[PDB]
């Protein structure tokens, strides 16, 4: 249902982890730059972690896209969805996380009727 | 690698697209850059830059200055152009009939010109009358008339106006400023 | 540097393969006598071969043609340099200096 996109290359699927995020619990994985003076990570020694930089950035034609080829866009209601009405082949819907189950059911039926894709069509379903 | 003979990724050092968020000025800039791009006219390009200019690189222009310019030869029936503001000057008592185009007009200057029988004009009206700068005359005002340019470049044997709040006796008129108290500069 | 007296074949190859014009401070590949006559038509030059003719039968407009030519960005030679260690003279068993007419071999490799 999507649009012709090129082949998607990401250039780093592995997550950039803060140095010693593994060693000390007080150091969390949220990436954070070693500004030190004798830091082999800042110095880019061999066998150390790769620091982020703008060459790892993605191709503009594939950027923000999901594997489907759609860009995600968050909806809380049929109105936000009707905004996406005419861009189904490029944009897909994410029902928010704070939504109630009955409103989710409504949104899902409406999206089916309008030919719109939904990437979380199982939130708060029993069976 | 490269043995660079320059500095890399350096900016031009020249303002494009001012950081005035005035939408009307931005409209003028859209207009005059279209005109600069197509009308092959140095006047259009000049005006575009002078629109990018800052407040102090956009000084005022006195109607008496305009009058000197029109007292030039071959320049009487011309159309004066000022990217900035036009100020009144009651140090004069006559004034000619010409038309003047500019961004801003002090109410006194506008009155003076209208009374002399001219018309005060905007740059868009100018762009419809004289796109390529037909029969125009650009004026810029003084820049080194400024009470910071007094202090710019302050050193010995330059005569360059120290930075000082209070004036008079016993405020920097002593040692350094006469041969009795040691030395004169 | 390694410098030498070049031949017509290597001039011609260097240009036809690595031929680049400094056109208002950009590096444009040549690909056309139209480009060449647009820029260097002033100097009686129309074709890449007329350019080469000036170059090798050094002319009164060699200055302008050579300056129009972006510097040739050569690769490292294919079969090597012929010597294990480079930074001696060509004479002492190295690479640099005036290798007056083996430069054609080197350049044809690097091209």
């Amino acid at each position: 249902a999507s649009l012709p996109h090129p082949k998607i290359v990401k250039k780093h699927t592995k997550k950039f982890k803060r140095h010693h995020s593994d060693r000390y619990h007080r150091v969390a994985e949220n990436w954070r730059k070693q500004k030190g003076i004798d830091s082999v990570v800042r110095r880019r020694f061999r066998g150390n972690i790769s620091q982020p930089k703008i060459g790892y950035g993605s191709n503009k034609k594939t950027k923000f896209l999901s594997p489907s080829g759609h860009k995600t866009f968050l909806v809380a209601n049929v109105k936000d969805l009707e905004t996406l009405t005419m861009h189904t082949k490029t944009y897909a819907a994410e029902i928010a996380h704070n939504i109630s189950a009955k409103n989710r059911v409504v949104i899902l039926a409406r999206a089916k009727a309008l030919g719109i894709k939904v990437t979380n069509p199982k939130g708060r379903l029993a069976l | 690698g490269i043995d660079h003979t320059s500095k890399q990724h350096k900016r031009s050092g020249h303002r494009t697209a001012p950081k005035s968020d005035n939408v009307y000025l931005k409209l003028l800039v859209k207009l005059y850059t279209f005109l600069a791009r197509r009308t092959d006219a140095p006047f259009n390009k000049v005006v575009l830059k002078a629109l990018f200019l800052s407040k102090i690189n956009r000084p005022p222009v006195s109607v008496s200055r305009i009058a000197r310019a029109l007292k030039q030869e071959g320049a009487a029936n011309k159309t004066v152009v000022v990217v900035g503001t036009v100020t009144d000057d009651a140090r004069i008592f006559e004034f000619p009939k010409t038309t003047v185009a500019a961004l801003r007009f002090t109410a006194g200057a506008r009155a003076k010109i209208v009374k002399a029988g001219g018309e005060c004009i905007t740059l868009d009206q100018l762009a419809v009358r004289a796109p390529k700068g037909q029969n125009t005359l650009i004026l810029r005002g003084p820049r080194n008339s400024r009470e910071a340019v007094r202090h710019f470049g302050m050193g010995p044997h330059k005569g360059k106006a120290p930075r000082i709040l209070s004036t008079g006796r016993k405020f920097e008129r002593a040692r350094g400023r006469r041969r009795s108290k040691g030395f004169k500069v | 540097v390694a410098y030498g007296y070049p031949s017509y074949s290597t001039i011609r190859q260097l240009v036809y393969k690595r031929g680049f014009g400094k056109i208002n401070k950009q590096r444009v590949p040549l690909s056309d006598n139209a480009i060449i006559e647009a820029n260097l038509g002033k100097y009686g030059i129309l074709s890449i071969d007329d350019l080469i003719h000036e170059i090798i039968t050094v002319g009164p407009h060699f200055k302008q043609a050579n300056n129009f030519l972006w510097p040739f960005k050569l690769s490292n030679p294919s079969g090597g340099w012929g010597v294990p260690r480079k930074f001696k003279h060509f004479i002492q068993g190295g690479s640099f200096g005036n290798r007056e007419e083996f430069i054609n071999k080197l350049v044809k490799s690097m091209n």
Binding site: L74, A76, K79, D80, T90, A96 | - | -
Partner: protein, 167 residues
């Protein structure tokens, strides 16, 4: 709302692709292949088998047969990069091979619903192979041991080195 909007939505109008300049020219086979020539199948069900080569079809394939009366190979179409061509040469002037073609080698593809639990052949193809194979054996009877050269299979042994071998 949860997310505001994008200002400009990109269009859906798919751009038509450009007029490519790739023509399709027929295949230039290697000079080691001429019809009536013995091949060695390297791959497939019939891997490692001496077989005959008759025709060069239009989908860059080669028409081939055992013959079936000899080694169990039927009429088939194979690939020149997946066969070795021998030096041995058998005459084939006298076969009506111009009938065969890609439509004759048609599969009638299988659907999706046809999922097999665990697990026919055309009289036309049978009698065709019979015609052709009787002609081929009749020509084979001239040179000696050839029937058996085909009936057997091909293999590499300890000490067999292809770049030093010839076929």
């Amino acid at each position: 709302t949860a997310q505001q909007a994008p200002k400009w939505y990109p269009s859906e109008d798919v751009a038509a692709p450009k007029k490519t300049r790739k023509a399709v020219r027929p295949q230039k086979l290697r000079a080691s292949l001429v019809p009536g020539t013995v091949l060695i199948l390297l791959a497939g069900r019939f891997r490692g088998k001496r077989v005959v080569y008759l025709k060069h079809l239009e989908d860059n394939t080669l028409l081939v047969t055992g013959p079936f009366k000899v080694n169990g190979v039927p009429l088939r179409r194979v690939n020149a990069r997946y066969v070795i061509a021998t030096s041995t040469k058998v005459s084939v002037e006298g076969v009506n091979v111009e009938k065969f073609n890609v439509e004759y080698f048609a599969k009638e593809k299988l659907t999706k619903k046809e999922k097999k639990e665990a697990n026919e052949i055309k009289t036309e193809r049978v009698e065709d192979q019979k015609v052709v194979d009787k002609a081929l054996i009749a020509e084979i009877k001239k040179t000696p041991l050839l029937k058996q050269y085909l009936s057997a299979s091909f293999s590499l042994k300890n000490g067999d080195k292809p770049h030093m071998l010839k076929f």
